Design a protein around this ligand. Structure first.
Ligand SMILES: [Zn+2]
Length: 197
C-alpha cells in the first residue's frame, strides 16, 4: 500500500504485464547505450538471454517496477562468458551450479523513486544474496561499471575483479566476482545469515 515489494522468480513465474514493465524499465535505462549488446523491440529491452530461463528480481512501489535485475546460471550461457569475454582477461569463464551471473541492473531514475538509490541497491542485494544463499549459491559474477564496483567495495562486500576495467560504450566496465561469504553477509545484514528449516 506504500511499502516496497521485492519479487524473485523464474521468468515463467511473472505475469506478462510485469515482464513488460521490467523490459520497459530496462529500455528506459539501456536505450541506445552502445557496446552493451542492447536490442530494443517495441520499447522493451529484451535479448536472447531472456529466452534462456533467467530469474528476475523486481522491486516495486505504488504498483510500479522501480528496479530490476536479471540472474543467469553459469552452467548455461551468460553475458560475461558470451557477450563480454574480454573482461575475463584470458581467465576461464566460471561454470558452476553454485555460481550465477547478474546483468541488466536497471533503476528508475525519475521523481517517484521513494527509497533512494545507494539503498535501493542495498535492498536489492539483501534480497538477492539471500535468495541465492538459500539456493546454495556461493558466488555472484557480473559485468557492471567501475561506479557500481566502488559502491559495493564501500558497502563492505567482498568483491574482486577478473582483470582491468575496459571502455564499453561510454562506460568503464569491469567483471566482478561477489563472494557471498561471511564478510558480505555481515556487510549486508549486520551478521551471518541463518536460515531455519
Ligand atoms: Zn505498501
Amino acid at each position: 500500500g506504500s511499502h516496497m515489494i521485492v519479487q524473485i522468480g523464474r521468468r515463467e513465474e511473472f505475469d506478462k504485464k510485469l515482464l513488460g514493465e521490467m523490459h520497459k524499465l530496462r529500455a528506459q535505462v539501456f536505450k541506445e547505450r552502445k557496446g552493451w549488446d542492447v536490442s530494443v523491440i517495441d520499447e522493451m529491452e529484451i535479448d536472447g538471454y531472456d529466452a534462456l530461463s533467467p530469474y528476475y528480481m523486481l522491486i516495486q512501489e505504488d504498483g510500479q517496477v522501480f528496479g530490476c535485475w536479471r540472474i543467469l546460471d553459469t552452467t548455461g550461457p551468460y553475458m560475461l562468458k558470451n557477450t563480454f569475454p574480454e573482461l575475463l582477461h584470458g581467465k576461464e569463464a566460471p561454470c558452476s551450479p553454485h555460481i550465477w551471473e547478474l546483468s541488466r541492473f536497471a533503476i528508475n531514475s525519475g521523481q517517484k523513486g521513494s527509497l533512494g538509490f545507494s539503498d535501493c541497491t542495498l535492498e536489492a542485494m539483501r534480497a538477492l544474496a539471500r535468495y541465492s544463499l538459500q539456493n546454495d549459491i556461493q558466488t555472484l559474477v557480473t559485468v557492471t561499471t567501475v561506479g557500481v564496483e566502488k559502491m559495493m567495495i564501500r558497502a563492505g562486500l567482498d568483491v574482486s575483479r577478473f582483470g582491468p576495467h575496459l571502455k564499453i560504450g561510454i562506460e568503464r566496465a569491469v567483471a566482478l566476482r561477489i563472494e557471498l561469504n561471511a564478510k558480505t553477509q555481515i556487510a549486508l545484514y549486520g551478521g551471518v545469515l541463518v536460515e531455519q528449516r
